[PDB]
Amino acid sequence: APQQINDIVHRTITPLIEQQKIPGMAVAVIYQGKPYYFTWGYADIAKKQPVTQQTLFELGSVSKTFTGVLGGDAIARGEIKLSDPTTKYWPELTAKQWNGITLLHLATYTAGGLPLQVPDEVKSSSDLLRFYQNWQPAWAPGTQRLYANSSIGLFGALAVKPSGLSFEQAMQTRVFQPLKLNHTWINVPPAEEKNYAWGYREGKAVHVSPGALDAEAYGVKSTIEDMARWVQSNLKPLDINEKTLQQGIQLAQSRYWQTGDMYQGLGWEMLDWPVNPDSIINGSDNKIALAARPVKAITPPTPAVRASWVHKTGATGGFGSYVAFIPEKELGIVMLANKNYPNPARVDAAWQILNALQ
Ligand SMILES: *C(=O)N1C[C@H](NOS(=O)(=O)O)CC[C@H]1C(=O)NC1CCNCC1
Ligand SMILES: [Cl-]
Ligand SMILES: [Zn+2]
Ligand SMILES: [Zn+2]
């Protein structure tokens, strides 16, 4: 790799690892459209298995960017419209509070206060229906953004219904396979388990536990090589030959809502570039990112702006992830770690690197 990339990566990530006590880490820096790979530490401490470019990490909420693009692909196929009512795809949701709640609201966390998690007691389809049927909104739809797995999670499950495919089958055939993300999994096959890093929480080795709508909201696992290719695909959608996927990527970076200097896409979040680094750093803290915040609708949604900072954070019990890219600069970064450490430290490090390479 160019010396300037090697230098800034060492001076930024090695101290981050020292500071946060991260056992293993993989980073890809995309510079002029080309990925450069870096690894540190161990995927499995006790086995002394090093992190490699083949190591699988839990992406956590970065999974939502796949969900958003799959939803955009469905829009481009004409299978769904974001203005469609939720009840069009789940007629059994007869409770009156669902009148006026659209796929757009589900996808962008603006349905009116759907909770951060689907309750852990939801283990059956019957349970899931009762959960949504009895949920009572705190606000009218389209007025407040409250980040919620139960919101975009339901969007993903309903967006694939017109295809007749399961969410996992839809994602594999329509997103993963066309983009040659051949080591990206909702469910890690047995033959690939050997590459699956352990997460570490308070010293204990852990993997994410199954839950309702997990695939849609936080359940994808991937390698640093596949995630670099994912970033390349979102930097350069015109290189994607499948027109519905090309357009789906573009639609996920459209700007549907604004709050402060932040714009809500489908999974992705965006800010204008050049960005105020303190905004993205401070705004990534859970105290802010998870707070209910008023939103202003953008009608029609702004088509993907090339001069944007596009990004997403993710976490599981034992992992911490971050992806950020700037289409106009063909510049991006993927940071995968097998410890959950605070978002602001990830974002700060990412901005130090990309700012140095602009
Ligand atoms: C996604 O990784 N999430 C959503 C939320 N934080 O959003 S983020 O952008 O700052 O990452 C909470 C943390 C995380 C999440 O929901 N993790 C689940 C916790 C419960 N067990 C399964 C994973
Ligand atoms: Cl140094
Ligand atoms: Zn040093
Ligand atoms: Zn393989």
Numbering used by the authors: 4 to 361
Reproduce text from the manuscript describing this model:
In reported structures of AmpC-DBO complexes, the orientation of the N-sulfate nitrogen can adopt two conformations. In one (conformation A), the N-sulfate nitrogen is close to the Y150 phenol sidechain, while in the other (conformation B) the nitrogen atom points toward the opposite face of the active site. For REL and ZID, both conformations A and B were observed and refined in equal occupancy. The N-sulfate nitrogen is 3.8 and 3.5 Å from Y150:Oη in conformation A and 4.7 and 4.8 Å from Y150:Oη in conformation B for REL and ZID, respectively. While the αBD angles are comparable in both conformations A and B (112° to 115°), the orientation of the N-sulfate nitrogen is stereoelectronically unfavorable for reaction with the carbamoyl carbonyl group in conformation B, where the distance to the carbamoyl carbon is significantly increased compared to that of conformation A (3.9 Å compared to 3.0 Å for REL and 3.8 Å compared to 2.8 Å for ZID). However, in the case of the REL- and ZID-derived complexes, only approximately half of the molecules are in the productive conformation (A), while the other half adopt conformation B, in which the N-sulfate nitrogen lone pair is directed away from the reactive carbonyl group. Based on the proposed decarbamoylation mechanisms of DBOs for class C SBLs and stereoelectronic considerations of the mechanism of the nucleophilic attack, the REL- and ZID-derived complexes appear less primed for recyclization, since they form both conformations A and B, than those of AVI and NAC, where only conformation A is observed. The piperidyl nitrogen does not appear to engage in any direct or water-mediated hydrogen bonding interactions with AmpCEC active-site residues. The Ω-loop and H-10 helix are located at the R2 binding pocket of the active site, and the different acyl-amido sidechains of REL, NAC, and ZID, which are positioned in this pocket, are likely to have an impact on inhibition of those AVI-resistant mutants.
